[PDB]
Design a protein around this ligand. Structure first.
Ligand code: NI
Length: 341
């Protein structure tokens, strides 16, 4: 049964609630983004209206075969009426097509559902600037002060400089980047751009990327692995056994692999700067774990919430344990006492 934190009171609406069968009283199902824990349950047999971004709707039609007549894509930054209720979709700074949803309830309550997001000061000048928010349904993935990581720009600078140096020293080195979902495309695209190569990948992953409205994509990716020196593999294959096997398949074109695993946070973050990151090496294979996050750090989250000043916070992540829930509630109270709302 659908948990309360997926339900929007005073409406017929749910958010990211496709794995519970027919939810009683739901007239419209919203989908914030195309990640499996959020879309779980959708397929070509779904017959209720799904509301989402254009990019999410391209993925639903092409990857899950949801029929067109049930997909209702909305433009961003635009007031729309859904089943009698004003809504707006805002960029979430998460993966491609990911949105936050503003609901303007018929009684005057305003609700922000962040979906998954990486808070940014640029959000302080969106349509959120223009009215009060009563209730915040918050992505609390990294809601504890241990969770620090660098900017996405510092991480991509590290990656590009590392790859360019390795391949210039050895023109017979292959670069490999792990993936298992959409998101984090800048990692492999930025490295291929500095090397003058396309990114090579499987037909299934090329199909996914073709749904994303990324400019000039036909110029940047390919299914012809032999023409590319940046390859994309499943995240599960980014280990010494998996990479040794891949190197066999390339027929002596290459004699070294440099591989990247774009994790979120790992506790090497509590001690080490990005500048100081080193790989795990075995023979002619090196693997870098890089802290490229598409979720808020603790400090980014705290700044957003202290700016927004919501009357009530509903966490959407880490809700399954009493210790996690009590930790998050203590931080919310600190934030509110420090800022004065
Ligand atoms: Ni996500």
């Amino acid at each position: 049964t659908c948990p309360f934190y997926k339900k929007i009171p005073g409406t017929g609406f749910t958010v990211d609630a496709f794995q519970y069968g027919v939810v009683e009283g739901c007239t419209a199902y919203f989908l914030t983004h195309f990640h499996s824990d959020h879309y779980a349950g959708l397929s070509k047999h779904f017959t209720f209206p799904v509301y989402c971004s254009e990019i999410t709707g391209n993925l639903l039609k092409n990857k899950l075969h949801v029929q067109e007549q049930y997909i209702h894509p909305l433009p961003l930054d635009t007031e729309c009426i859904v089943n009698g209720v004003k809504v707006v979709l805002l960029d979430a700074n998460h993966c491609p097509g990911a949105v936050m949803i503003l609901f303007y309830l018929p009684n005057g309550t305003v609700i922000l559902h962040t979906g998954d997001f990486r808070a940014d000061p640029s959000m302080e000048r969106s349509l959120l600037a223009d009215q009060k928010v009563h209730m915040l349904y918050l992505d609390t993935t990294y809601c504890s002060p241990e969770y620090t990581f660098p900017s996405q720009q510092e991480v991509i600078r590290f990656a590009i400089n590392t790859a360019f140096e390795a391949v210039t020293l050895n023109p017979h080195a292959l670069v490999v980047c792990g993936t298992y979902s959409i998101g984090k495309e800048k990692v492999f695209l930025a490295i291929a751009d500095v090397l003058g190569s396309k990114v090579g990948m499987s037909q299934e992953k090329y199909k996914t990327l073709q749904c994303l409205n990324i400019p000039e994509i036909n110029s940047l990716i390919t299914t012809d692995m032999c023409s590319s020196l940046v390859h994309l593999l499943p995240m599960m294959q980014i280990n010494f056994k998996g990479l040794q096997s891949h190197l066999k398949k390339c027929g002596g074109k290459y004699n070294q692999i440099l591989a990247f695993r774009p994790t979120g946070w790992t506790h090497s973050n509590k001690f080490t700067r990005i500048a100081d990151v080193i790989p795990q090496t075995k023979g002619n294979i090196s693997i870098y774990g890089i802290p490229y996050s598409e979720h808020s750090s603790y400090l980014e989250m705290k700044r957003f919430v202290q700016w927004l000043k919501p009357q009530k916070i509903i966490p959407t992540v880490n809700v399954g344990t009493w210790k996690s829930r009590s930790t998050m509630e203590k931080y919310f109270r600190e934030w509110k006492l420090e800022a004065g709302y």
